[PDB]
């Protein structure tokens, strides 16, 4: 009855207390040295035992006794690789991890537990993997659907997963001949994630893939305003709106919890011009599986 690729979905094969123990193959900082906060791309071995699809997540159990004397609870991460993985052997999973480092209003430099465990992982070391988890951020069954994707920072992950299966891979029962559109919002150029891969896709399928970046510190619009994901979206407002009125249009949103706000601000302008209340309409879209959000 569903409109998304949930044919034989596997959810929760591995549990938090009995997780799959994998090993780190690769792990690379994919952001410039001058960027605000480092992000790492890491590839894990699964020997094919974690049957995830595009847009799912895996939980990681970080090594260590916690500040009470018991094992850490898991932390969820969107799967940054495709079903068949970065190597295409269907034996790997990949993650897009921001190293959480902040300084608290008590003066101390605080390092987030799991993200630092992940960004400090060496090839060969063991990683505890759970899941996979998720059903909300699955690809649309329809290979001719309009797939609008909006991400900020590590929130790019499920879209990288999406797009790899769309343009980088050949599949018998899937031949993408729709329109895929990515809006990726970051602060600096050095904070761009996977730009190279996306660029390659654009010139490989100019008819089927559209790519807009939004670099808030370095870019500006006609009113001289900072380029956030919605500021860039605004530039195609009337066009984006038109696609949303179509029943084969699937929107996905992923990243910082705050991102959801500005987009709505832009969507009010749009829908009001056509006499519709956006918040009211969003509900129709959600229940029709067309507006899809996973923010954190
Ligand atoms: C569905 C889902 C998908 C996700 N995908 C990704 C992903 O793809 N990539 C990624 O990097 N992360 C992703 N995350 C978030 C990921 O779980 C974080 O790495 C994790 O929540 C925090 O990392 P940690 O365990 O290192 O920090 P923790 O040790 O758990 O500490 C986090 C806590 O620190 C506090 N805190 C955080 N920042 C500040 C601050 N600036 N000032 C004061 N206090 C603060 C908050 O209370 C927060 O709960 C995802 C989360 C979800 C729910």
Q: Considering only CA atoms, which residue is closest to atom 5 of ligand 1?
A: 77
96 lines ligand 1 (CB under 6 A): yes
Q: What is the CA radius of gyration of the chain?
A: 19
Distance in Å from the first CA to the final CA of the chain: 29
174 lines ligand 1 (CB under 6 A): no
Helical segments of 108-234, H only: 113-119, 157-163, 195-204, 229-234
Q: What is the largest CA-CA distance in the chain?
A: 58
Q: Among 98, 102, 115, 256, which is best to mutate for testing ligand 1, by the most ligand atoms less than 8 A from CB?
A: 115
Cα separation, 57 vs 41, in Å, equals 15
Please state, in angstroms and as integers, the Cα–Cα distance from residue 290 to each residue in 156, 176, 245, 253, following that order.
Answer: 18, 18, 11, 11
User: Which residue, of 80, 105, 133, is where some domain finishes?
Assistant: 133
Same domain, 158 and 203: yes
Q: How do the residues of the chain divide into helix, strand and coil, expressed in percent and rounded to 5?
A: 25, 30, 45
Same domain, 122 and 147: no
Given the residues 45, 57, 78, 191, select the one marked as catalytic: 78
Strand ranges of the sheet holding 179-186, from the earlier edge strand across to the other edge: 209-215, 179-186, 146-152, 249-255, 291-295
What are the backbone dihedrals phi and psi of residue 130, each rounded to the nearest 5 degrees, phi first? -115, 165
Same domain, 103 and 191: no
What are the backbone dihedrals phi and psi of residue 20, each rounded to the nearest 5 degrees, phi first? -75, 120
Based on the structure, what is the number of domains in the chain? 2
Same domain, 30 and 149: no
Please state, in angstroms and as integers, the Cα–Cα distance from residue 265 to each residue in 148, 157, 261, 277, following that order.
Answer: 18, 25, 7, 12
User: Which residue's structure tokens are 């956006």?
Assistant: 278
Same domain, 125 and 184: no
102 lines ligand 1 (CB under 6 A): yes
Q: Considering only CA atoms, which residue is closest to atom 26 of ligand 1?
A: 112
The residues that bridge with 40 in the sheet, in sequence order, are 29, 97
Cα separation, 272 vs 128, in Å, equals 48
* Resolution of this structure in Å: 2.9
Cα separation, 213 vs 151, in Å, equals 10
Cα separation, 231 vs 272, in Å, equals 18
Given the residues 20, 77, 194, 252, select the one marked as catalytic: 77
Same domain, 146 and 258: yes
Domain that holds residue 74: 1-133
Same domain, 179 and 284: yes
Contact 50, 106 (CB under 8 A): no
Nearest CA to 229 among 242, 214, 239? 214
Nearest CA to 87 among 45, 123, 37, 36? 45
Q: Among 35, 37, 97, 100, which is best to mutate for testing ligand 1, by the most ligand atoms less than 8 A from CB?
A: 100
User: Which residue, of 133, 159, 189, is where some domain finishes?
Assistant: 133
Angle between helices 259-273 and 278-287 (to 10 degrees): 110
Same domain, 20 and 159: no
Tell me, yes or no, if 294 is annotated catalytic.
yes
Same domain, 293 and 164: yes
């Amino acid at each position: 009855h569903s409109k998304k690729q949930d044919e034989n979905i596997v959810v929760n094969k591995f549990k938090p207390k009995e997780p799959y123990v994998g090993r780190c193959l690769l792990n690379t900082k994919i952001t410039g040295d001058d960027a605000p906060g480092e992000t790492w791309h890491m590839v894990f071995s699964t020997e094919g035992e974690v049957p995830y699809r595009e847009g799912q997540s895996i939980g990681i159990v970080p090594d260590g006794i916690d500040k009470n004397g018991k094992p850490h609870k898991l932390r969820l991460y969107s799967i940054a690789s495709s079903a068949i993985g970065d190597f295409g052997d269907s034996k790997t999973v990949s993650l897009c991890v921001k190293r959480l480092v902040y300084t608290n209003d008590a003066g101390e430099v605080v390092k987030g537990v799991c993200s630092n465990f992940l960004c400090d992982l060496k090839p060969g070391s063991e990683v505890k993997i759970t899941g996979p988890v998720g059903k909300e951020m699955l690809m649309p069954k329809d290979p001719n659907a309009t797939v609008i994707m909006l991400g900020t920072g590590t929130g790019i992950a499920p879209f990288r997963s999406f797009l790899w299966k769309m343009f980088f891979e050949k599949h018998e029962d899937y031949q993408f001949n729709g329109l895929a559109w990515l809006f990726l919002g970051v602060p600096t150029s050095s904070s761009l994630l996977y730009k190279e891969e996306f660029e390659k896709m654009k010139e490989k399928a100019p008819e089927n893939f559209r790519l807009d970046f939004a670099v808030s510190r370095e870019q500006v619009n006609d009113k001289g305003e900072k380029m956030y994901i919605q500021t860039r979206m605004a530039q195609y407002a009337e066009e984006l709106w038109e696609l949303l009125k179509k029943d084969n249009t699937f929107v996905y949103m992923c990243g910082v919890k705050g991102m959801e706000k500005g987009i709505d601000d832009i969507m009010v302008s749009l829908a009001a011009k056509d006499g519709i209340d956006w918040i009211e309409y969003k509900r129709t879209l959600k229940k029709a599986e067309q507006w899809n959000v996973e923010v954190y």
